[PDB]
C-alpha cells in the first residue's frame, strides 16, 4: 500500500495490537498493578484485576512519535479525572505520575523508547524497523 | 371537517393588547365573500394557502 | 430475589424461544420482565455475539438495536 507512519487508526488498531503484547511474557510492572486508582478523582479500582499496562504499547508509544519530543506530564495529561471536591468546581485533575515515569523505565529495555536530547524521550530505529512494520502488520492483519 | 382551503389574501395588521394576535384575511379564492373575520396565531409571511375546518363563524375584537 | 439477579435458569433462552410478538431486547425494555438486571442482563445477552436472531449493525455501548431480524 505504501504504508506510511500516519495511516494508523486509533481504536480498532489498539484492540488488535496492544492485546498481542498481553502474552509476550511481558510482566515488566513495578509490582504496583491493581493497587492504583489511575486518577486522583477516581473512586473505584480499574477493570481487569491484572495488567492493563499493555495499552501503553499502542496508546502511549504510538503517540510519542505523533509528536517529535515528549515528556511525562503531558502523557499523564490524557488521564483526566474530576474529583467531586465537595461543593466546588470540578477542576483540572490528573492521575498519579509515578506509573508513566516507571513505564518510562520499563518498556525502555525493548529498544522502542530511546534517550533523547531536545527534551525527554523520542522514538528510535526500532520504530522504523518494528513500529512501522506493526503498522504494516496490524493494519495488514486487519485489511 | 369541511376543509375551506384558506389563504392569506391581504396583510391586515395586528390586534392584542399583550401583542399576541396578528391579523390576516382567511378564505379560499374560489367562492369568496363567505369568510370568518379572523386571523392567524403567529408567524406568516406573505400570500400563501392554508388548511382549516370552519368556514363562516365570526368574532370581531380579540384582546 | 425479586428483581435483577442472575440468569433465570428456569426460562433462560427467550432469545430463541420468545421473539415473536415482542421484538424488544435492550436496557430500556427488559427490566419490567421480572428479569435479571443490566449488571448481568445483557452480559447474559451477548452470548449471541457471533450470530443470532437479534442482530446489531450499531456497535455502540449502553443500548443496542435488537429486534426480530435474520
Amino acid at each position: 500500500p505504501g504504508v506510511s507512519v500516519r495511516d494508523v487508526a486509533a481504536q480498532d488498531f489498539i484492540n488488535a495490537y496492544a492485546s498481542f503484547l498481553q502474552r509476550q511474557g511481558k510482566l515488566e510492572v513495578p509490582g504496583y498493578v491493581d493497587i492504583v486508582k489511575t486518577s486522583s478523582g477516581n473512586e473505584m479500582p480499574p477493570q481487569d484485576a491484572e495488567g492493563w499496562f499493555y495499552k501503553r504499547a499502542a496508546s502511549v508509544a504510538r503517540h510519542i512519535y505523533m509528536r517529535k519530543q515528549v515528556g511525562v506530564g503531558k502523557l499523564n495529561k490524557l488521564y483526566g479525572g474530576a474529583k467531586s471536591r465537595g461543593v466546588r468546581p470540578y477542576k483540572h485533575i490528573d492521575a498519579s505520575g509515578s506509573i508513566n515515569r516507571k513505564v518510562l523505565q520499563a518498556l525502555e529495555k525493548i529498544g522502542i523508547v530511546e534517550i533523547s536530547p531536545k527534551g525527554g524521550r523520542r522514538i528510535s530505529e526500532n520504530g522504523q524497523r518494528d513500529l512501522d512494520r506493526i503498522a504494516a502488520q496490524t493494519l495488514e492483519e486487519d485489511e | 371537517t369541511p376543509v375551506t382551503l384558506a389563504k392569506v389574501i391581504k396583510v391586515l395588521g395586528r390586534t392584542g393588547s399583550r401583542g399576541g394576535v396578528t391579523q390576516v384575511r382567511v378564505e379560499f379564492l374560489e367562492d369568496t365573500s363567505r369568510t370568518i373575520v379572523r386571523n392567524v396565531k403567529g408567524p406568516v409571511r406573505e400570500n400563501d394557502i392554508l388548511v382549516l375546518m370552519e368556514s363562516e363563524r365570526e368574532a370581531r375584537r380579540l384582546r | 430475589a425479586q428483581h435483577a439477579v442472575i440468569l433465570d435458569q428456569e426460562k433462560y433462552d427467550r432469545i430463541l424461544k420468545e421473539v415473536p410478538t415482542y421484538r424488544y431486547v435492550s436496557v430500556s425494555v427488559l427490566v419490567d420482565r421480572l428479569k435479571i438486571g443490566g449488571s448481568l442482563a445483557r452480559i447474559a445477552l451477548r452470548h449471541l455475539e457471533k450470530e443470532g436472531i437479534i442482530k446489531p449493525i450499531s456497535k455502540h455501548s449502553k443500548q443496542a438495536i435488537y429486534t426480530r431480524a435474520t
Binding site: 506510511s4 507512519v5 500516519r6 495511516d7 487508526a9 486509533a10 | - | -
Partner: protein, 141 residues
C-alpha cells in the same frame, strides 16, 4: 505540476493553507487519511465537491494541508474549504469556466456557507452578569 497557490481553509478556528498541487489524488492532514478526522460522524459533511458532480476528480489534483490551533468546528468546513478551493480556483485559471460552471451541478447546489467567508464572530462579555448577554437577578429590600 506544482506551483503552490496559497489557498486557505479559513473559518472560526483554522488558520490553514492548502498547497493543492497536481498529482494522483492523495490527501494527508500532515499524514492523515480520510478515515481519521475526529468526529467519526461529522466527517460526512465533506461530501460536497467530490462525489456529487464527478466520480474521479483525482488525477487533476493533489491535496496536502496542515491545520494548527483552534477548536472543534473547523475540522468539517475549514478542512473542506481548503480542499474545495483547490478545485474551482485551479480549474478556472487553467481549465475553462464553461467546463467548470456547466459541470458545477453540485459544487454550488449545496453551498452551505462553504467559500463565503464566515461572518459569525465572537463579541466581548459585558459587565454585571454571568455571561455575554446573561445578567444577574436583582433583589429589593
Amino acid at each position: 505540476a506544482v506551483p503552490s497557490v496559497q489557498t486557505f481553509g479559513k473559518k472560526k478556528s483554522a488558520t490553514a493553507v492548502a498547497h493543492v498541487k497536481a498529482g494522483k489524488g492523495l490527501i494527508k492532514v500532515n499524514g492523515s487519511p480520510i478515515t481519521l478526522v475526529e468526529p467519526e460522524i461529522l466527517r460526512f459533511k465533506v461530501y460536497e465537491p467530490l462525489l456529487l458532480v464527478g466520480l474521479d476528480k483525482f488525477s487533476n489534483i493533489d491535496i496536502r494541508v496542515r491545520v494548527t490551533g483552534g477548536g472543534h468546528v473547523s475540522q468539517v468546513y475549514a478542512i473542506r474549504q481548503a480542499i474545495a478551493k483547490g478545485l474551482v480556483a485551479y480549474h478556472q485559471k487553467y481549465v475553462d469556466e464553461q467546463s467548470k460552471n456547466e459541470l458545477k451541478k453540485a459544487f454550488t447546489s449545496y453551498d452551505r456557507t462553504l467559500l463565503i467567508a464566515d461572518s459569525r464572530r465572537p463579541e466581548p462579555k459585558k459587565f454585571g452578569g454571568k455571561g455575554a448577554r446573561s445578567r444577574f437577578q436583582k433583589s429589593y429590600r
